[PDB]
Design a protein around this ligand. Structure first.
Ligand code: CA
Length: 74
């Protein structure tokens, strides 16, 4: 039932990808994070998804959504 240990790592990543350090990000470097250690989405997966988030969501992702989307492992 690991979570806080795995999440703690995401916190560092979120900031690492956060260049504006404004406490927010988008489907820009987000996809680059999934391939870093996530699940490495396919070709259209990293696109269809990134966009889906860009459109559906609104065009922004918070450390919460990033963590939630990242999930534990699967
Ligand atoms: Ca930010």
């Amino acid at each position: 039932s690991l979570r806080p240990e795995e999440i703690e790592e995401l916190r560092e990543a979120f900031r690492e990808f956060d260049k504006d350090k404004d406490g927010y990000i988008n489907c820009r470097d987000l996809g680059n994070c999934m391939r870093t250690m996530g699940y490495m989405p396919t070709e259209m997966e990293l696109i269809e998804l990134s966009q889906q988030i860009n459109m559906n969501l609104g065009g922004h992702v918070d450390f919460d959504d990033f963590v939630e989307l990242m999930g534990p492992k699967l």
